[PDB]
Amino acid sequence: MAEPLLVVGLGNPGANYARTRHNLGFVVADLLAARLGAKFKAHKRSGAEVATGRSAGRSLVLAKPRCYMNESGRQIGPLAKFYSVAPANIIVIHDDLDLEFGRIRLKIGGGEGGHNGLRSVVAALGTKDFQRVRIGIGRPPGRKDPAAFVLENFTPAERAEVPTICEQAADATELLIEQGMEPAQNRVHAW
Secondary structure (H helix, E strand, O other), X not given: OOOOEEXXXXXXOOOHHHHHOOOHHHHHHHHHHXXXXXXXXXXXXXXXXXXXXXXXXXXXXXXXXXXXXXXXXXXXXXXXXXXXXOOOOEEEEEEEOOOOEEEEEEEXXXXXXXXXXXXXXXXXXXOOOOEEEEXXXXXXXXXXXXHHHHOOOOHHHXXXXXXXXXXXXXXXXXXXXXXXXXXXXXXXXXX
């Protein structure tokens, strides 16, 4: 009974489109990073960003390429098969529309909500029941334009929401390591 955990933050490089929270993975990774203070880097046979983290009585490998999306799917593909890690150890973070623009969505099997990247990860990783941590950024009002509405740019609204949820999820995470998620979920996953 012993095994580390791997984390992968899927977001959007550069910017422009990243403003649409298309950089949740990197936004959350950076946040949790700026908090942890860990000194990440960029390399690996793949050539992406990553950093090790010790806590929760276990190590944590947080990685994240550039393009992320497809870059991640593939990046992990080999990187995943390279490290030979388990699916219950790998956790891919992303953004998704669930309710309002300031919620999170952490699950295991549940994932892949239409995306070349995500699909590239499944095909790259071949699917092993890996874990995923999607964020709840607004919800689909209809069929008018969900993706369009998901790729808005609440830079501001999101700016406050980014730290709002991140803060909430950050607490849930910390508490999770403190004891369990039960409280974090009832505390954080309660709002």
